[PDB]
Amino acid sequence: REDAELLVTVRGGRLRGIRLKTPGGPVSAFLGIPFAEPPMGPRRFLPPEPKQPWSGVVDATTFQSVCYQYVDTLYPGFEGTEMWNPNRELSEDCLYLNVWTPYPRPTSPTPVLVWIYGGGFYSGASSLDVYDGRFLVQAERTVLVSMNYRVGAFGFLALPGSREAPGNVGLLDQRLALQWVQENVAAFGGDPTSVTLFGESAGAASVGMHLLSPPSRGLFHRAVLQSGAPNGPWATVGMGEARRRATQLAHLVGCPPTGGNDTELVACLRTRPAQVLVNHEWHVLPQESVFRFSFVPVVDGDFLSDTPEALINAGDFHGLQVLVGVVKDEGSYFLVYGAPGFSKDNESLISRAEFLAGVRVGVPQVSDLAAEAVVLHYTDWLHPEDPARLREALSDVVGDHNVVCPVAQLAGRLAAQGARVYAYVFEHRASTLSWPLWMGVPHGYEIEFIFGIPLDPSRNYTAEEKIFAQRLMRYWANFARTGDPNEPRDPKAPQWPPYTAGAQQYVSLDLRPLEVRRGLRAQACAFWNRFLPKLLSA
Amino acid sequence: DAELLVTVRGGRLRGIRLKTPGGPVSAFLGIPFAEPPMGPRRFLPPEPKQPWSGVVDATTFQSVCYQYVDTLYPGFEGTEMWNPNRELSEDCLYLNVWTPYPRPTSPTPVLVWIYGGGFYSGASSLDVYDGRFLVQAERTVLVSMNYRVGAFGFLALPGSREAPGNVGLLDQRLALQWVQENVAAFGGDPTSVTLFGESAGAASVGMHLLSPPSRGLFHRAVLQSGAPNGPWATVGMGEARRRATQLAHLVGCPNDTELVACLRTRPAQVLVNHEWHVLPQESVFRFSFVPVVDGDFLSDTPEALINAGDFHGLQVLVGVVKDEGSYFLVYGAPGFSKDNESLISRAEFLAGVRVGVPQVSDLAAEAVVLHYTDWLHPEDPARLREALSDVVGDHNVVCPVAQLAGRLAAQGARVYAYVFEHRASTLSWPLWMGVPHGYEIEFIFGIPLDPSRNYTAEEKIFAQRLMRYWANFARTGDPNEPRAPQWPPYTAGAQQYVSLDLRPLEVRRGLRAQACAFWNRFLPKLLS
Ligand SMILES: *[C@@H]1O[C@H](CO[C@@H]2O[C@@H](C)[C@@H](O)[C@@H](O)[C@@H]2O)[C@@H](O[C@@H]2O[C@H](CO)[C@@H](O)[C@H](O)[C@H]2NC(C)=O)[C@H](O)[C@H]1NC(C)=O
Ligand SMILES: *[C@@H]1O[C@H](CO[C@@H]2O[C@@H](C)[C@@H](O)[C@@H](O)[C@@H]2O)[C@@H](O[C@@H]2O[C@H](CO)[C@@H](O)[C@H](O)[C@H]2NC(C)=O)[C@H](O)[C@H]1NC(C)=O
């Protein structure tokens, strides 16, 4: 009749899961658990409501729908883009989370990893192949949780001050899921007193915002920020700019038939089909850029009482352990989405005039003086027009500005203000990687190793890549268990030292053993983090 | 001895025979080329020397123009070699001619030397400017003049006739006119005159390049460690008026006519004693009275003039020493001394920057600290010493010279560039200063051939090389010897220059190209 391992009772009612086959053995998965009431109709743009209790058994046996989002059509049928696109139907009914647990269920409380996906706050889903938790859970005996959260207008359109579209509800979705983990993870054998958040890109930025928001900060203990930071220039927006964007979107879909009473405007927005909002959301940006990020978290005093930059500087982070890192070529991926002269299908050897144009697109919304400063810093004046060099330099501009330097600034301030910080640069280019060689190790391509995807037999990774994947999973689980990625009791293994504002040490992650190195693009980031904001005042 | 008797338009001269290790040389030292600029003539353009009867005694150097005397390290060779070595006088407008013995009987190419000293000091009589070795070795005629410095040469009340400014530059021009009219009497060829100069002397040369009435007085130019577009080399009309006015107040003077008349009653030495504290801020530089851009001598700023010029038909030799900034740091950069290693702290570095780069905004200063900090070693004392040296040298010498070279080459000129990288075995400054500002000059003039001095045999050969490059350039506009690794022209693209040291010429690219992008391309956009 029934199998007890696959049955669990959470506060809301009963659930039935599936037994998953992994190369190392069985795992229990409960996929598609509802944690909020569906944010439908009148509940569009509103904070999430906790899921009301149910009778009978909910089947948590497959991933639920993807939240409504734009679908990338740049390179149709190309694996490099398609691997990030929705693999379930789009629905506004998307507030479900997923729990993976060992088979049989742990008998003593087990550390929990909670994954928050990225996608620029306009896309992403917990159901992507590359976020499959079955391999981590099996290899390291942790519980893994991932949630869906609203993106785009649905998650971050804000008319600040109003009750009908207060903004940041996508982050509130993440918080509700975190509250759910507190109240329920024990039922799966998980330890609500050992919860580690981790996420990549917009997911990392979200992790960081939970760090800086007191009502979230109580729901977890440790944090991992992969290739993103809450102080990233794309990651937040001001109350005014948020309103301008909300309002422009409304206008574009015929709402108020501009501005006016917020209640009327939002009610008119609620009558539009989801797909219509999605279709117009690319229009609301002030400048042509490679960062299609129309709606993102808003600094409005509520979720964030001040800018993330400010909150970081003012904060006491004693008793916090954090793991942070970046891939070797953060910038390259983004360049084929707009920068003149770039394509995945040629060498993208750009001209100097193409380089100058690329700087404005890769660093949108800075003054001409600031742009000049960028061009000066990144030009090699002994070779000002070498196409190969200009390509590399532009990739560095985009990467440094949007990822590496926000991450370095976060790491430095946290370390100096009480946190134990560990830092990495991921340098392995997958044998399976379908992007061209000149892109190096692009944004996003460490995730599949962290989740242990190369252990999937149907995939064609090398045996060394399997070993490497197992190393990374070990570091992450070590960090989740102890706050330290280092092998507890292993001495002949090279040691990963803490990152500090002075020595600035980090390790390289590739097939070779750990190599300790200094500075996260230190010269470059002094420009973005120390000088450029002073040029902003005067 | 008839070789020592010469008649110039003004009258008759008696010179002196000098010895060198290579043979004799004829020298005519202390020739008057202007009426003495004294009493009512203080601050005025030079008047041509009125003819004389009898024979001028031209066997010894004449007086040094009034100037501050450096007392930072009394008795120290490294500083005393630049101080006056004759008595001070406002009666100082004399020039000197060295020529082969016996005097050439066919037109010989002429080198004309303009000394540096921040426009506040210097003299043609310093040992290190001794023309005898160049003249014997390379058979040129060599001329050097004294020109008025400090307030006496560059105090300006723009618009006034009583003190129009730039008269020290006019002293230089008048001497160049003198050379046109009289150098043939010594065997010199007035159709082959090369100007060379170091530091403010180099800025002077460049200024003559950019001023049409001077441009007809010479044919080729050498600019050593200085350039007319240097941030210290000129002053705007308004700021010149302010500094003049402040000097007047400091010496107790109260209408331009009235002000200048009162200044003219003050002993020269009194003006000198107060010239230092008219500057708008503390600085390692003592540069109160400098050439003023007033539309007359310079119709525009040297920067503007350089950008707008057609320089086809010009050949220029330019260069710098390896460590331009180090020398200046011991004159007021906190934590610096010639007598210790000058290992400064970061706070001292930050302070030093405001002193090495005066009168720029905080934002500008921050940018300087950004560019020159190694953010992996932000506090290493040795690295900080080196970087502050870099800052001062880049800003004041290397990047103005680089900009001048690039623009001239891109606008028709043929440019040759060098970096001078030999530290003299006899150098009396500490080792951490490397090759400091001014210490190529003694090699160019062949001072190492003086047997009474203690240079090595390698060093004498080196000097001979440098004398040959320089005279080659004066004769043909090309320093190269026959095919020897060749010295290529400097171009805005390839940016090639050669290293001058004991080794053969090594060709390299870029005169601190990354650093000078900061000073020459970015920083101007900021101040807008
Ligand atoms: C490299 O590619 C870009 C992108 O163009 C597309 O991708 C190429 C691989 C190739 O398949 C092209 O036919 C595609 O159009 C090129 O930039 C484009 O150039 C075309 C023609 O000049 C122009 O109309 C587009 O606007 C350009 N697009 C952008 C984003 O600038 C680039 O020239 C290619 N470099 C080569 C071929 O050397
Ligand atoms: C290196 O020397 C400087 C200069 O000080 C002078 O030269 C020294 C060799 C010694 O003879 C001192 O007595 C001289 O004053 C030092 O900077 C000075 O430090 C003292 C310390 O109180 C201070 O009073 C002076 O104002 C400083 N002078 C300047 C120009 O900043 C420097 O500390 C020495 N470096 C060392 C000792 O490591």
Ligand SMILES: *[C@@H]1O[C@H](CO)[C@@H](O)[C@H](O)[C@H]1NC(C)=O
């Ligand atoms: C907006 O309109 C609604 C519709 O009746 C009204 O109740 C509300 O008071 C209005 N909002 C404000 C701020 O006045």
